[PDB]
Ligand SMILES: *[C@@H]1C=CN([C@@H]2O[C@H](COP(=O)(O)OP(=O)(O)OC[C@H]3O[C@@H](n4cnc5c(N)ncnc54)[C@H](OP(=O)(O)O)[C@@H]3O)[C@@H](O)[C@H]2O)C=C1C(N)=O
């Protein structure tokens with residue numbers, strides 16, 4: 001557990017992991033806090049949540065600097081992330097009570113309804129790629145619902161993890177309602193197996209999700225998994241090509257490519273493929289790579305040496321198999337974990353890369369001849385998180401919406417998360433939904449009540 | 453896999469388990485069937501579901517005889533079970549389309565909404581205690597939603613399992629949309645690990661649920677677990693005592709005691725405990741034990757020799773520890789797996805039985821002094837399925853509703869399932885909800901759509 005600046009490779013600060021006894025003490029405190037917190041009014045929870053939003057809104061640049069220092073996303077995009085974190089806090093402050101109101105169903109009972117009550121301690125395991133937003137995405141509805149939470153954040157963002165707890169303390173949430181656990185992956189099993197822990201949510205890779213979900217399953221505890229994707233970005237002949245190129249470039253390269261809903265596989269109708277690809281090539285080549293603290297920077301370093309090694313290998317093996325590099329395709333010879341925007345074409349059938357997530361600014365490009373071929377190729381992956389399709393033909397739009405095997409389909413725009421709309425995967429991308437109504441309904445006891 | 457009549461102990465018919473190759477073939481057919489079935493209209497699904505209801509409504513006595521023969525519940529209660537099976541078919545026929553309609557949310561999109569689409573093949577693992585109802589509980593919404601299903605039923609109800617498939621075939625559901633798998637517990641892992649199987653649901657005991665959920669978690673597949681309970685039946689001084697005794701007797705002894713939402717622990721306020729307990733004793737004492745095919749029978753045999761052995765041991769060990777037998781407490785000296793209505797009192801603190809499910813007509817009785825003590829004792833179990841409380845004081849009613857740790861709280865009535873209201877557990881009783889809106893929302897892709 002350490003801050004290692006990916007721009008310089010320098011070790012900035014190390015942290016001692018909690019011991020099992022310390023983890024136990026935190027869970028005992030969470031349980032005690034829950035017994036009181038479940039009795040708080042929505043007005044109190046709303047006040048504290050809105051206070052947290054105001055803290056995020058005031059000190060956006062400072063929080064952004066922590067994110068950038070630890071994991072290398074641009075400071076400007078980290079500012080946006082802090083702003084979006086405030087937004088989801090406000091969303092559940094504004095809607096959470098209504099979303100949890102009794103729902104009455106007419107029967108022969110004098111009263112029959114479902115009410116919604118918190119479960120207790122929720123474990124959250126989170127990744128470094130959106131180190132504030134993913135935490136607030138689960139924490140805002142958890143806290144509004146009256147759950148308490150323990151967070152196991154990624155081992156390379158301890159300062160972000162501590163900052164989130166500090167924000168919630170300063171906002172006024174009682175001690176034990178939210179606790180950051182500075183612990184490694186091997187220490188999570190103790191938490192899942194603790195009788196006081198009632199549920200678990202993980203955003204991350206498949207092996208992490210499989211580990212957490214298998215353990216939780218053994219303990220009869222509900223889970224939600226938000227895993228990776230290889231989202232298609234489909235461009236058809238009636239599309240606004242210049243908009244599609246611009247937006248596609250952002251979709252692939254934002255967050256230095258490290259997003260679950262990045263545009264990863266560009267699927268181009270043959271009628272427009274040559275024009276699109278040339279423009280894509282030019283746009284990618286103009287991106288500014290460098291110090292993520294500089295406001296002009298488009299592409300900072302990848303977050304870790306491991307990610308750099310992995311993408312470098314994935315690309316090298318694809319090229320060895322016969323894939324062509326249109327742009328990029330090799331790590332930069334400079335300090336920090338830098339990998340350039342890359343475009344791969346003519347990838348051989350059966351190449352392993354076709355089935356993998358490229359968690360870096362590396363676009364795979366394909367050409368197709370018709371709608372059926374586009375949909376088949378789009379779905380020919382183990383994942384099913386998001387999908388974007390570009391067309392102004394209403395019949396095509398409807399087929400894309402209906403037939404793309406994903407948790408989200410965006411027509412003529414890049415996939416984005418928005419607190420107003422539920423968000424989650426299908427297939428190997430996970431199950432369950434965050435945000436919207438779903439986010440606050442996942443980890444509550446929907447209690448049926450019948451009164452004679 | 454066999455029909456063994458629990459009234460006589462006679463082995464009536466044996467069945468060959470499917471081989472792994474045969475299971476694979478059924479999954480291949482389910483996948484092909486799903487590809488077409490997902491394209492059917494709600495009108496077709498509704499027709500087939502309503503046809504299934506009409507079949508159940510016409511031949512209720514015949515289906516009931518199969519249930520009674522295989523697992524020993526009274527023929528009269530099996531008729532009611534067939535009727536309730538028809539009811540949940542009609543519920544989803546009548547509401548399913550509306551329940552799955554697009555839900556629009558205003559954004560800057562021209563259109564933004566959530567739509568609901570089937571996942572694919574759902575595995576269901578079901579128990580012998582309600583061999584028709586629990587199947588239709590999951591199958592009706594699955595089929596209305598456009599999923600297909602494979603059923604692994606309990607090994608002692610193969611004729612029930614085959615009958616459910618035959619009903620659905622006769623109703624018009626296309627081949628492969630629903631398939632009964634005559635397979636043992638060891639064969640379920642293959643099904644969960646098959647890439648075509650997208651989700652799994654289990655109703656049963658904790659070890660079964662832990663096995664299925666841990667395996668599904670490893671495969672990144674969503675689950676729903678409906679497990680056992682030790683539901684409290686709390687009786688306070690303002691209760692209608694005679695009604696509470698009558699209803700409590702039904703709640704403990706229906707289905708020969710073998711219900712997840714049986715009243716298992718009677719928690720009596722000291723002011724009324726003597727009167728209530730005497731009346732409960734009297735009611736249990738005069739229940740008619742005998743051939744479950746006879747309409748006058750209240751109590752048939754327990755379903756299996758294993759259940760009989762288990763309850764006999766649980767009671768014996770409790771008594772050896774110091775518990776008192778007010779009534780019953782030993783197997784009957786006759787053919788078939790008969791165990792009599794039993795009441796245990798004065799159970800020593802720390803006796804293991806206090807924490808166990810009594811899946812037989814055996815009531816544990818406790819006395820308490822006030823509301824706080826009643827709630828504490830009611831919740832002092834690993835389970836949390838249902839809870840019933842009897843009082844006509846509004847303040848007490850509200851505290852019971854709010855503070856009983858269960859998925860369902862019934863005031864002045866016994867806990868029952870009803871298609872109109874969601875149903876499920878908390879704590880070690882499971883997670884997820886069947887019935888109501890919840891039942892048809894569990895295993896669908898909630899797909900967010902955003903159209904510029
Ligand atoms: C949208 C945004 C992101 N994602 C998807 O997440 C992954 C990110 O990849 P990576 O950072 O490499 O994930 P990871 O799984 O290694 O780590 C994530 C967290 O899980 C912990 N962890 C790893 N392994 C385990 C085990 N076995 N048990 C418990 N916890 C584990 C990690 O801990 P450390 O190793 O850092 O200590 C970390 O906390 C991409 O696939 C991305 O697409 C999902 C999104 C969405 N759907 O919302």
Ligand SMILES: *[C@@H]1C=CN([C@@H]2O[C@H](COP(=O)(O)OP(=O)(O)OC[C@H]3O[C@@H](n4cnc5c(N)ncnc54)[C@H](OP(=O)(O)O)[C@@H]3O)[C@@H](O)[C@H]2O)C=C1C(N)=O
Pocket residue numbers: 577578579580581604605606607608635636637638640655656657658659660661663664677678679680681711712713809811837876877
């Ligand atoms: C309302 C009604 C019932 N219940 C709860 O269910 C159990 C019933 O007890 P029992 O019949 O003894 O359950 P079981 O778990 O042994 O068997 C149930 C099904 O699961 C299969 N099975 C057992 N073990 C496994 C494993 N390891 N893997 C997969 N499948 C398994 C059984 O198969 P067979 O052994 O018969 O072949 C069977 O299909 C009580 O606790 C009751 O309260 C839940 C209800 C509710 N919440 O809705």
